[PDB]
Design a protein around this ligand. Structure first.
Ligand SMILES: [Cl-]
Ligand code: NA
Length: 185
């Protein structure tokens, strides 16, 4: 299930995060700490209903972190190839001349076929050959059918603080201190 935000639900601008911390837990997994601004009753009720549905159905929570949305690499990834049999800390790909721009160390990365999110540690190229160094090491050996993902990356997580989720209506008619602690699953 997608954690609702102002992109899925622009009617609730309060679902836009105030602060986000991406924590490295070293298999390696990312921890995500999200802090909300004060939420209006409709926003809080909608978020609460969506987290109750997540609790009811033992699903994951997919989350977009807009602070990593730099759109540094653009274009159609259809003819972009990732050769099979790769594992370790590097992903080599052939852009086929279809991608504009280049990624930077600190950017996120994901393979289209697997949920793991990586951090880019280094980038080098030789024409259409891109060499992207990743942290942590690849969770799978490539099959050759994967596509690189630079934008719109969703982290697949589980909620860690469901037992301390919630708030009470304050004197301003809003809900303060709402925060989500997520663990990449
Ligand atoms: Cl592997
Ligand atoms: Na949100």
């Amino acid at each position: 299930m997608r954690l609702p935000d102002p992109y899925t639900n622009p009617e609730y601008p309060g679902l836009g995060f105030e602060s986000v911390n991406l924590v490295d837990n070293d298999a390696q997994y990312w921890g995500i700490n999200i802090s909300y601004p004060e939420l209006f009753p409709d926003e809080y009720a909608f978020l609460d209903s969506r987290l109750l549905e997540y609790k009811r159905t033992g699903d994951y929570l997919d989350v977009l972190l807009p602070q990593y949305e730099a759109f540094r690499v653009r274009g159609d990834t259809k003819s972009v190839t990732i050769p099979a049999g790769q594992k370790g800390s590097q992903i080599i790909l052939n852009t086929n001349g279809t991608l504009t721009g280049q990624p930077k160390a600190g950017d996120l990365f994901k393979l289209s076929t697997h949920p793991k999110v990586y951090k880019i540690t280094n980038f080098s190229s030789s024409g259409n050959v891109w060499n992207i160094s990743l942290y942590p090491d690849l969770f799978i050996t490539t099959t050759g059918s994967e596509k690189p993902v630079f934008n719109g990356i969703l982290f697949r997580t589980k909620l860690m603080n469901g037992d301390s989720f919630g708030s009470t209506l304050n004197n301003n008619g809003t809900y303060s201190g709402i925060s989500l602690s997520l663990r990449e699953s």
